[PDB]
């Protein structure tokens, strides 16, 4: 019947105060939460943040709201949320967030005869996380998400997850292009500020870099220019005016890689791991041009010394550079 | 009990005016403040501003709000803030700011039986600060933050900090990549406008540049091109058609550094300290090409003069450039 329900809700709201949390003098409230993740949009190493969109749910139990005469479990419109009590809940490591308001504001009110209240949301959050780029790009990032109450202390409100094998779903929906997902952890603390002890639930997960792309970008140029710096050893010195045309170009090419490839890179002050790598390949083409520099000063003394340099040459650069790889590719992995 | 409190609040708001500040005819109000800083996001030298996020707190003491029958210290919901008096408080050197409204508007009301009212906020502020870039990048910046009342004069309202060794916390949480934090100062003034004298509290702190990055960007190119401008002195003049190929390239390379490195730079009219430095290294490779220019005009007169030029040459450039460093790196530090 339509008749029972309208006067039933009005009995539940006549004299219902909105300014106070339930069980005010007595025991603290026991609020559980639940998160379903839709997707993670993008990760900016420039701004050290990321953007996701979740489904945010909450339980609590108010004795002020307890119908009796209806066996059904109710469902109301979102405009009743301005006439009820909700707990204050905010995100700690965020920078900008909002609630989707496409046709209505996406929030859900659901009731139960005991007083169990379900409160859904749909929030897009730009949350910031600090990054360590010492091992860039062979890195593992741990970007987190923390949830707090704001006004109430731990004497009034009690956060808890709804089971560690639960309450975080939608994991395999996450498709980052650049990264990959590893692990989940769930945290419950008691953080104490200058006012008082506050509860906190935290969400944390690893991020692993997909390595199989930057070889195509960074490494395969710097592989080949080492080999193009080795052309001169098989070049007989009759093109002594044209040997340097290689030796200018390769040193110039590393400068372009130092700059034009830098345009696709973030900006930190401390030294990245690829910077030591680009320091290493820059030194060899700097020394490969210093092959011919010691040629032209003592070639006039004797060519017999200059006849033996390419015996010295092509037995050093294809091993010091190869051992430079095994220092590089093993100190990290 | 639930019964006492609801009628207690209603006695505190029946006939409570919102249009007037407490102790209206009598003495001025004595409002204290308190700031906790979460983080500083970014510093734009392009826009001369920075972005932080704080926890903003206030005290005052209203005799209109004084419950007696409850030994507890209360805590209310943020919707009661539209039915109370708050002091007008704004930031002076800002450009755009807002209050986080993630699930609710992040503000806190806390009461006490005497009338002590605590009012919390959580504000992200884009505040502008003027910069001096004479000593760029070996600079110290003093970007500030000032807090004023808006409508009330000093006859009504009285700002004060809650102890100079207090009221600004969260210092070591600040992690700028580019800068570093030095010192804190706290200011209390009496600023007078055309209307009347207004109070002000100000927050100020130094910013020191992390120097160990721009060597990798700016200096190590300009170091090496000076040395690559010294290759020609050990070059015997048989490659007189190929000496100039160095001398064109280095002068061209400084032009790229004058322009492509300029793309990663701000825009001021007055002369930066690195501009005098890039003026200096540009002159030497301009004069190193003017070595060969005086070669080819009097080589036909005698090679005996041209036999002595590299005796003149490599005893001047590795000292005038080295003394150019000691003028540069000591006039600043």
């Amino acid at each position: 019947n339509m008749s029972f329900v309208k006067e039933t809700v009005d009995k539940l709201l006549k004299g219902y105060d909105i300014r106070l949390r339930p069980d005010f003098g007595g025991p603290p409230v026991c609020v559980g939460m639940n998160i379903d993740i839709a997707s993670i949009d993008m990760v900016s190493e420039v701004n050290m943040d990321y953007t996701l969109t979740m489904y945010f749910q909450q339980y609590w139990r108010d004795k002020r709201l307890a119908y009796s005469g209806i066996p059904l479990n109710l469902t109301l419109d979102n405009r009743v949320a301005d006439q009820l009590w909700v707990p204050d809940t905010y995100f700690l490591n965020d920078k900008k967030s909002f609630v989707h308001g496409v046709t209505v504001k996406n929030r859900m009110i659901r009731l139960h005869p005991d007083g169990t209240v379900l409160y859904g949301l749909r929030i897009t959050t730009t949350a910031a996380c600090m990054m360590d780029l010492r091992r860039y790009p062979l890195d593992e990032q741990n970007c987190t998400l923390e949830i707090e109450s704001y006004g109430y202390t731990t004497d009034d409100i009690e956060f808890y997850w709804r089971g560690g094998d639960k309450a975080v779903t939608g994991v395999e929906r996450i498709e980052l292009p650049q990264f990959s997902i590893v692990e989940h952890r769930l945290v419950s603390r008691n953080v104490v500020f200058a006012t008082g002890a506050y509860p906190r639930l935290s969400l944390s997960f690893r991020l692993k870099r997909n390595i199989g792309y930057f070889i195509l970008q960074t490494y395969m140029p710097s592989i080949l220019i080492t080999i193009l710096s080795w052309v001169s050893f098989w070049i007989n010195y009759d093109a002594s005016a044209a040997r340097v045309a290689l030796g200018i170009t390769t040193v110039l090419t590393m400068t372009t890689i130092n700059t034009h490839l830098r345009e696709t890179l973030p900006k930190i002050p401390y030294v990245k791991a690829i910077d030591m790598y680009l320091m290493g390949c820059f030194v060899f083409v700097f020394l490969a041009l210093l092959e011919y520099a010691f040629v032209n000063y003592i070639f006039f003394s004797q060519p017999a010394r200059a006849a033996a340099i390419d015996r010295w040459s092509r037995i050093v650069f294809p091993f010091t550079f190869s051992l430079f790889n095994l220092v590089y590719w093993l100190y990290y992995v | 009990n639930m019964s006492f409190v609801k009628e207690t609040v209603d006695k505190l708001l029946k006939g409570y005016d919102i249009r007037l500040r407490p102790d209206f005819g009598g003495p001025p109000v004595c409002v204290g403040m308190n700031i906790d800083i979460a983080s500083i996001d970014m510093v734009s030298e392009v826009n001369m501003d920075y972005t932080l996020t704080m926890y903003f707190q206030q005290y005052w003491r209203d005799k209109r709000l004084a419950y007696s029958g409850i030994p507890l210290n209360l805590t209310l919901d943020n919707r009661v803030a539209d039915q109370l008096w708050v002091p007008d408080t704004y930031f002076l050197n800002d450009k755009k700011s807002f209050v986080h409204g993630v699930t609710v508007k992040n503000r806190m009301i806390r009461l006490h039986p005497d009338g002590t009212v605590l009012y919390g906020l959580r504000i992200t502020t884009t505040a502008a600060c003027m910069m001096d870039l004479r000593r760029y990048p070996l600079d110290e910046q003093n970007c500030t933050l000032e807090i004023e009342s808006y409508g009330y004069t000093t006859d009504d309202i009285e700002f004060y900090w809650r102890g100079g060794d207090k009221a600004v916390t969260g210092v070591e949480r600040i992690e700028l990549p580019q800068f570093s934090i030095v010192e804190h100062r706290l200011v209390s003034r009496n600023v007078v406008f055309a209307t009347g004298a207004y109070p002000r509290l100000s927050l100020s702190f130094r910013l020191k540049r992390n120097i160990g990055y721009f060597i990798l960007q700016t200096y190590m190119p300009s170091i090496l091109i000076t040395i690559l401008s010294w290759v020609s002195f050990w070059i015997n003049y048989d490659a007189s058609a190929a000496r100039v190929a160095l001398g064109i390239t280095t002068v061209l390379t400084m032009t790229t550094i004058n322009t492509h490195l300029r793309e990663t730079l701000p825009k001021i009219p007055y002369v930066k300290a690195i501009d005098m430095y890039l003026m200096g290294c540009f002159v030497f490779v301009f004069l190193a090409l003017l070595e060969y220019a005086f070669v080819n005009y009097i080589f036909f007169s005698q090679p005996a003069r041209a036999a002595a030029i590299d005796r003149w040459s490599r005893i001047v450039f590795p000292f005038t450039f080295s003394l150019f460093n000691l003028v540069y790196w000591l006039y600043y530090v």
């Epitope: 700690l92 490591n93 600090m130 360590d132 741990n142 987190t144 923390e146 008691n190 953080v191 104490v192 500020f193 200058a194 002890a197 | 916390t169 210092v171 070591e172 949480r173 600040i174 992690e175 570093s180 934090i181 030095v182």
Partner: nanobody
């Protein structure tokens, strides 16, 4: 995950000088701030000092305002604690501890996660 260890005990007469140390290990990037306390022989601990990760700021407590100077090393991952003009009210154990990044105020022992077993320093008349 992050294991800690100190060094530097002993005993001096009153008003002398002494230096501390604390070692680090593991993924220390997730713990920017490190701090110290003193479990009294009868009482609980009280805050003395804290240091930023970059080594810039160094906040104190009110009694230890400009009494003790405490420094930073990124390279050895150590913290150095220079005590000068020592007092007979300083005989306690100084525990090394770190803090998570988004982890509350500076003065609270409940906040910290990892703990190194400090040394027992004493001082005579």
């Amino acid at each position: 995950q992050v294991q800690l260890q100190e060094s530097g005990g002993g005993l001096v007469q009153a008003g002398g000088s002494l230096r501390l140390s604390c070692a680090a290990s593991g993924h220390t990037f997730n713990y920017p701030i490190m701090g110290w306390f003193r479990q009294a022989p009868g009482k609980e601990r009280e805050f003395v000092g804290a240091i930023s990760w970059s080594g810039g700021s160094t906040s104190y407590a009110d009694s230890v305002k400009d009494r003790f100077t405490i420094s930073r090393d990124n390279a050895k991952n150590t913290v150095y604690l220079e005590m000068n003009n020592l007092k007979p009210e300083d005989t306690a154990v100084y525990y090394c501890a770190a803090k998570g990044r988004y982890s509350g105020g500076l003065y609270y022992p409940t906040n910290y996660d990892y703990w190194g077993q400090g040394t027992q320093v004493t001082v005579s008349s």
